[PDB]
Amino acid sequence: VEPVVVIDGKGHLVGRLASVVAKQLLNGQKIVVVRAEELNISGEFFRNKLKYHDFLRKPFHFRAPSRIFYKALRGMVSHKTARGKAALERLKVFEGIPPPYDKKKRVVVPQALRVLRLKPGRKYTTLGKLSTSVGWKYEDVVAKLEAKRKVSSAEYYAKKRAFTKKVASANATAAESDVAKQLAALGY
């Protein structure tokens, strides 16, 4: 339905998000993933640092959270095939929200959120912490310039809220009229 979909990785499970993205873009849907560093994995820090060195001690290994997510997505797609290679060309993963994706709406997957999937009172791991612990050196800059992203975007939202205030006032003053009642009668 959407020519390009931007998915906010924060608060989502790596496995569920990877599976849903693989299924979606295997059907030709273009998907973009942002804020991968904020992606979460179930379980406390231990047993999440583990199971990574286990396969590491075997090739080339990538420490960036985006590369980890791609590897998770890569194994869920029939790579080495033209369809698999073509499907993987419709995927983009970045840390934070670099432009121009910062100026566009970002969606989430209800069936992949940690809150809706993980039972309360259970420890969970975050991709950023694991990446830093396994040698990632860009967490500091990622956080620093993500905080700046919220800066002045709060101001943009405030301006939008102010504009919508005037829009609502204009609607209300024109409301209750004959045309307004006619529209409300037809569910609009």
Partner: protein, 106 residues
């Protein structure tokens, strides 16, 4: 008018197939806004067309079209099986297809 569309958009997923055996004669088509067999029941019998651009000139256009028909529902997520006079090239997996409204029953 802004939009000239008179058909429901859909995506071609893959042919009906087993683990190691596939049946190209029967294609699976996903219909936008359809997620249950009951909803897909309305689309049964409707003509489905696939539109793609060609490199060489044709009999009065530059677009070539492959027509098909809906046969039966598939799965539980609203997937529907479609049949065409000429089977799809298997390269359209994930491509966009046009599900027309005729023949109508309303």
């Amino acid at each position: 008018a802004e939009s000239h569309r008179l058909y429901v958009k859909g995506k071609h997923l893959s042919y009906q197939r087993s683990k190691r055996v596939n049946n190209p004669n029967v294609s699976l088509i996903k219909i936008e806004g359809v997620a249950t067999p009951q909803d897909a029941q309305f689309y049964l019998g409707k003509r489905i067309a696939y539109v793609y651009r060609a490199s060489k000139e044709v009999r009065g256009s530059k677009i070539r079209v492959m027509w098909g028909k809906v046969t039966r529902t598939h799965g539980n997520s609203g997937v529907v099986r479609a049949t065409f006079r000429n089977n799809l090239p298997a390269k359209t997996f994930g491509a966009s297809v046009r599900i027309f409204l005729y023949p109508s029953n309303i």
